[PDB]
Each structure stands twice: as C-alpha cells, then as structure tokens.
Design an enzyme around this catalytic site. Sequence first.
Site, PDB file in Angstrom:
ATOM      1  N   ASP A   1       0.814  -1.214   0.000  1.00  0.00           N
ATOM      2  CA  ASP A   1       0.000   0.000   0.000  1.00  0.00           C
ATOM      3  C   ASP A   1       0.850   1.267   0.000  1.00  0.00           C
ATOM      4  O   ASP A   1       0.439   2.298   0.526  1.00  0.00           O
ATOM      5  CB  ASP A   1      -0.982   0.014   1.174  1.00  0.00           C
ATOM      6  CG  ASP A   1      -1.943  -1.157   1.145  1.00  0.00           C
ATOM      7  OD1 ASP A   1      -2.255  -1.646   0.039  1.00  0.00           O
ATOM      8  OD2 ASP A   1      -2.382  -1.596   2.228  1.00  0.00           O
ATOM      9  N   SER A   2       2.036   1.208  -0.587  1.00  0.00           N
ATOM     10  CA  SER A   2       2.823   2.398  -0.866  1.00  0.00           C
ATOM     11  C   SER A   2       2.534   2.884  -2.277  1.00  0.00           C
ATOM     12  O   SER A   2       1.966   2.169  -3.102  1.00  0.00           O
ATOM     13  CB  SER A   2       4.317   2.129  -0.715  1.00  0.00           C
ATOM     14  OG  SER A   2       4.672   1.951   0.633  1.00  0.00           O
TER      15      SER A   2
END
Lengths: 303, 69, 119, 359, 124
Positions: free
Chosen positions: C53-54
Amino acid sequence: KQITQSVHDIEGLKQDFRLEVGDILYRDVVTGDVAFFNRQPSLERSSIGVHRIVVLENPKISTFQMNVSACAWYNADFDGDQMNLWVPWSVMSRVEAELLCSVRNWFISTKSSGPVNGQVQDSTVGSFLLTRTNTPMGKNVMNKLHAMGLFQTTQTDPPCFANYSPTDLLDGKSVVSMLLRQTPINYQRAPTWYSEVYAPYMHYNKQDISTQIRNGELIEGVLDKKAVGAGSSGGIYHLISRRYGPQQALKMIFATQQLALNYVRNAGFTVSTADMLLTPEAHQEVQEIINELLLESEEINNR
Amino acid sequence: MLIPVVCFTCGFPIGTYAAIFDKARTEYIKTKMASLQIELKDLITALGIPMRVCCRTHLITTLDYRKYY
Amino acid sequence: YCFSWPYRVDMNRFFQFYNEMPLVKTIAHNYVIPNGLNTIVAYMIYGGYNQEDSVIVSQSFIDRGGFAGTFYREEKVELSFGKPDPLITKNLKPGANYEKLVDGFVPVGTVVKKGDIII
Amino acid sequence: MEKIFQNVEIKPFLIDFSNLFIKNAAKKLFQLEEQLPLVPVNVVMDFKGISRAAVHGLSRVLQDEIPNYMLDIKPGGYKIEDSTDLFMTEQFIRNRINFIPIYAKNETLVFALRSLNNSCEVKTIYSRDLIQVAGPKLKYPIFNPTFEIGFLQPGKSLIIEDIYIKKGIGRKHAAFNLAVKTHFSHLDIEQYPTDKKEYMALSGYKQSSMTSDPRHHRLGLCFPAVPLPHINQAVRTYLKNACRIIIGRIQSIQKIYENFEEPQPELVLFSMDEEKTKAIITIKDETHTIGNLLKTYIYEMIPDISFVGYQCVPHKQEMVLTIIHKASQEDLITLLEKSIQNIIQTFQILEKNVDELIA
Amino acid sequence: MSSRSGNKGIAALALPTSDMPFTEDGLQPDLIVNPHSHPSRMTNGQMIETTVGLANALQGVVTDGTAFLPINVQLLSERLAQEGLRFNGCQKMFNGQTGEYFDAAIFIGPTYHQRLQKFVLDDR
Ligand SMILES: [Mg+2]
Ligand SMILES: [Zn+2]
C-alpha cells in the site's frame, strides 16, 4: 566534562576545544548505528527489533524507511502505520542491541519455529516471472547485459559473466543459481504455481511444476510463495538459515528480492480491468451454472 | 483555483490556452444545449493541445474558483 | 475546506489550491465540491517501492502544485504585549530568540522557527 | 560514413482559428487573431546506428537535466499591503509564475506585477500584466500574454515587484523542466498488431527487451515555448546544449579516470585475486543518464567483461559504477578511457548532425 | 493519498520526470500503484474508473459513474478500443531510468485521487 561534572552545549564552547579523555561527547546518529524499531501493539517477540541505521540525508524525507520484507516482524504495512524508533546511546544498551535484539535473531519465529521473513508481493510474483521456463515472448532468456543488470542492486559481490558473450542467452534459473551458489542448499518441492484446481485447464509446463535446487543450482520449477514466500517453512530462506545462519538468510532475501525486482524492471507486471473480464461464452457458462443452483434451490422449495 | 499553468502530469503548458478554452467551452456548451457530457475533443484540438490523456484531463476537469465562490 | 478561509482564523485546516472534477463523477459531486485530482496512475511494479500500500509519486507532479496547499495554525494568548527588556534577564526563556518582535508581535510575513518568540 | 541523427520533423503546435468558438474567445479575451508569439513545437527525431543508452540519455537531459530558465519572485518581492487580495497568496502565485514557460536569452530581466481591481467584480490577472522594468527592452516577448496569473476580488490589489529569471535543472525543480515526451519507439524491432486479443497484453515488440539491442530509434520531444519565427534555431540550440551537457559530465568522469594514479574519493581500484581488477566509481548527484551511458559503452568496448553495472539508489543521491574485468588496473583504465572517448565521439557526431539537419 | 474506492496509500518515492516510466506516446504516471493492492481488497471500482476515464479524457467528457447505475465492463473496454486504445487500457511502456520497454503492456490511466489530511510533518 567529568572534571566539572557539567554538561556544556556545543555552541557555548569558547576555548573548550580540549575534548579531553574521560568526558562524554553526545554525537549525532550516523549510518551503521543500531536502533530499536518498534510497532505497537507489541504482541510478538519481534515487535521490537534492532536495525542498522541508514541515515537519509535528503532533508525532504521524514519517514522511517524499511524493507518490505522486514514488515513481517512487526505485522506492519505502509497504509499509514507509525513505528517508534530509539537509538541506544549507552554502551551497555548498544552492545545488547547489536548482539541480542538484532532482527537476525527473530528471523525464525519463536511462536511457530518457522521463518518469518521472505518475499512478499512483487518479489513473490517477480521470482516466479524470473524463474518461469517460458514467457509469451518465447523462452525466458536474457542476454549478458540484462543478466549482469539483475545483479546491479544486490549489494553483494557480483558473479562473473566473463565466460558469456554479449549475444549469449541466460535463463532466469541460471541467473538465480548464480546467486544461490553463495549459500548452496538443497530444496525439492512443488510450487504454489502448480495446483490441482487449476490443472484441468491451462497448460502446465513440466519444467515449471517441480522446483528443485541442488547445491544452490535451481534446475527446474519456479520460485514462488512455497519457496521464497514469507512464513514458508522449509523454504529456501529457512534452509539458508539452518545451514549458514539467519543473517545469511536475511542477506539472501534481499539479494533474491533485488533479482526479482530488477527482472520485473524489464518484464513489467500490471493488472487491468480486462484481466477480470469473462468472455461472452464464459459468461453464459457461468450463468448456466447459477441457474442450476437456483433450480436446485427451487426444487427444495417445491418439496 | 484556476486551470494549472502547465499539465500536472507532463508539464505541457495548458495554461496558455486555459482562458480561451474556458470561454470557448462556455460558448460551445451554450449552443449544444448533461453539460459535462458534451464532447470537447474538437475544441481542445483547435487550441493546439495534443491528444494527451493527462493534458486534456486537467484541462476539462479543473474547477474554477471564480465559478464556485 | 471553507470558502471563507482567509477571513477565518483556523487551526489544523488545510486549503488545497487545485481541485478537479472527477473524470468519472457520481451523484454526490452535484452537492459536495470535488476535492482531489485526476492523477494519471500506472498499475505496475516499479522497483518494489510501492509495495504494501505504498505509492510512487512523480516529483514533478508535486512541484507543479499537485495536492499542494496551505496549512494554518492559530496562536491565541490572553493578558502587557511587548518585547521584554534586558532588565528582566533572569526570567527570560532559555535560548529564545526574542528578536523579530515589533510592538509585541512578530510582523506579518516573517518566517518563524522553533527558537523564535512570538507574541 | 553514416549520419547517426537522421531526418527530423519539426512541427509547432498552433491554434486553429478555423474553429469559430476558439476565434471568438481569443478575440474577446486577448484580441488575438493570430498565433501566439511563443508556441509549443513537437520535434520528432530519427536516430540510426546508436545505442538506446545514448538516445534515452539525450531524452532525459532534454527533459530535466538541461539548464533552463523560469520566472521566480525574489524574497520580499511579494508586497503585502492592506489592499492585497487574500486568495492570491504568495505560494499560489509563485507556483503560477514559476511554471510559465519562458524563452529568455537574457538573465538580467526583472518583471513586475502591479494589478489593482477597482471595479465591482472579480478581475483576472493575465501574463500580459507582467510589465518589465530591468535589463534591455524585449524586442520579442519571452512568455505568452495569455496565462492566468490569478484573479482579484473587487477592491483588492496584487503587487509583485521582483520577478527575475532563475536558472536550474528540472530534476531539482520541475519549473526548469524543458521538454515533454511525445514519442519513443525502436524502428528496427518488428511489432505485433496489438489490437488482437492475443497481443493486447504484450508491449507489441516481437523481441523481449531482455534480449533486444535496438539501434534505430524514433524520439519525439515537445518544447513548450519557442519563438514562432525562430523555431529551428531554438530546436538546434536545445539539441546542441543537451549534447554538450552530456559531453561535459562525461568529461568530468574522464578527469576522475585520468587522475587514477593519485588516490581519489570518487574512484577506487582493487586487484581481487584472479588477475581481476575491480573499479568502483562514485559520483554524487549523478543520475541514470551517465550511469547507463557508461555501462553501455564499457560493455560495448569490453564484450568479455566479468561484470559492469551501475546503481543510482534514490537515497544516497549518487551514481555508483562497478567494473570488474580480467585485466590490470592500467589496462582497465585504458579501456575505460577509450569507452569514454567513444561516448564523447558519439555525442560530438550527434551535435554535428544536429547542425547539418535542422539548419 | 487515497482513491475514491478507499485504497489508502503512503507516498514513498518522488521520482523526477526522466525517472518515471512513460508510454510510447509519452504519457507518464503521477502515481504508480502496486497491482498487488487490488486482488485482496477487490477494489474493482478503481479499475473500472480508470478504464472509463481513459475514454473520457480522449472524448473530452465527464461521465456519471454513480453506484448501481448499469455497468457493462465489456462495453467500456470496447469503447476504449473505439477511442483508439487497446481493449484493455494497457499501453507499451518504457522504463524511465533505462529506456527499455517493458515486455508487458502497462495499465495506465486517470484515477481520481485524494490527499488524506494526515500529514507526515504533523505525525512525526
Ligand atoms: Mg496498516
Ligand atoms: Zn500532460
């Protein structure tokens, strides 16, 4: 200054340049210092670990940066998680941090006795793409320049390609074996890629459905969650830890991660809306299956 | 608050034609008639903005503060 | 966040300069001002920097004003206003600048830092 | 003999006044019946017999590693008075002004913005309102007058007195970005018809990028603001400046190479064990352009190299190039020097062809 | 940063213009989102939004994508094909750091993104 038993700010030192032996200097954190890295809630034994500090000299960066494979220790992700960090300043706490609380000691789970770390996400799917026998372009080969380019970021001593001509082709299994030879292990297991639910459909390549490693030479099969995945007991990183130490496994996780990431740097990997789209013939097949379930429910009603 | 001077994505200067585009879009909508469902494909082409997904996205979607305040 | 932002004195309120209508809008945007941008996004693996989730962002997109804005903080104190004289000395804050003060307050347009004294 | 840089198509982006709405709007707003003094120009260049590293390095330089000018506001130049508009903050307006594309020969020009809305409704500040008070008077404008700098509420003013011309490169701030990418393709690799369901998931090229070595490239770059009467001269100057920037950086690395007999922080040499010498070159603030060029030309010059590779880690802000070869330190340095000379010759030929073609 | 499908994300990389991947037409992303962020959370609305917005940008329109409106992803993909793109929204793409094309066509298009007001300078 221990002779005055007093602490002096560094700006107010008129002629105190005599930093005399026995006084304590409080210096900034430099790269290579050890620091305690903690995510809350601290539930596991690995919720606090000691990492070597890499100081990010870019002034615009204000985040704690960590390898994605180190997240398994803290059950962390990058959707807004925050973690505490303190740098041991005392000599006793620094010796302790290096020798006892280093994250190499938490590579094997105390809870389950299996490995905690491994490849996740891009490195799991990038290891499969690297080591698969065939691509849509044909054989999964790369030339000497791209084989060399896979080892650019591994931060290990690069292998020798002097026996390869520029036009010589190297398999993904060949370049993986170039790295695994440094910690030779024996592994033989079926990959996550091969499964019986998928088998009736799809053409499974025989060279892909049996992962075998002999003395660090990957000769067949793909590398995926079963072999390189995080938490995979009996995987290659668990084996490297058993024979060479958990620190070698951590270095091998990073090195194989770089190979997988540098491969997808050329292979490319994406997901599309058309990836989730059934063909009009297959959509009718699915509709007919559901109509069978509704009729079976309808007959139960008639009963 | 205005259409950006350049495209946010690639840096092509859509703000050169931002004002002309806004006025011309108002006029061309007023002839045609949702209002947002009228095609500006040809209007943007006439200004010299190329068929770039980024440049035409930021040109036709940027909210004008003078229109709301 | 509020069309009367400059008249108001706000705390922890962020005003974003540029907003876009979504290319795919919904019925909600007929009633609430769209905030955000129609960023061009590539769903791809790029060096493993967008894992878990970067996101990898274009530095130029940041420089060009994308999601840029102004953050506001309010400083309210209650009672005399004035720069302390050197006669006080002992009670003065340790290491505080105490400069950049005109008529007891910092002038409008002055960049204040951690060590500075305001009001 | 062969010309590396082959034919080029230079086509400016022009307003179509055959569109009634565009013509009416331009006439009503700016009294504009003709093309703007500065237009975007799309330059499509063909290259033959040249590595992808050189062509892409040229593209990267022309994008954001070439020195470029932009309008910036000096500290204290945003005059805060009682009548200043409360919505046109210094940050918003500075961002607007920074990204106005300018074509400036002279760095000693200073502009001023003195706008006051005495009317009863909102007045829009345009780029034509930037009056110049410094340096020689502009025979030709450096920016277009149609940019919306901002808008003023009734009774509000906006004074910006020190708008000078700043220099920098686009990888430090995107206001210095010069060229935008419009095309990149390899002309010596066949392509599938990608509208087919069987090929729509692939790139299209019939060779994997892990094995292909294309030498025939099409590069298409758009420049945002060049004067309309002087398009070819501006494009030539841009291309030549990019080539010379590349040559200069390569020559700095050449200096480090030639100084190898004296210890240097940026170059480390070892003899490891088996007649192999390891050369590590570390240049701070160096990007993928030079690293890729160096790796490609070292590889082309030493096909039997043990290892050549570079890393530009996003942090540590440096390029680290590692060369391992079965040769002595002096012989390795000689090969590296000859590869650097090959790079310089390539880009000098590129500059000569630039002069020959666009004219 | 977040999309309207609730897929939060922390920005950790700022690449320059020359370092970003670009398509054959020079289209380059503002955000690079991991495909691994899709399959588990099943944020297919974001995929469909990108597919529709690719054709919206080229047609110069803004379309209603409200929930429970009739949806036909096959027809949206056919619309993509009619606008001159591929059936999928995938394009030939080049690595910005090396200039090498990816072997796979990359799905790239406009997705509305929002900046959540949790700031790293406030948090740290
Ligand atoms: Mg989380
Ligand atoms: Zn654009």
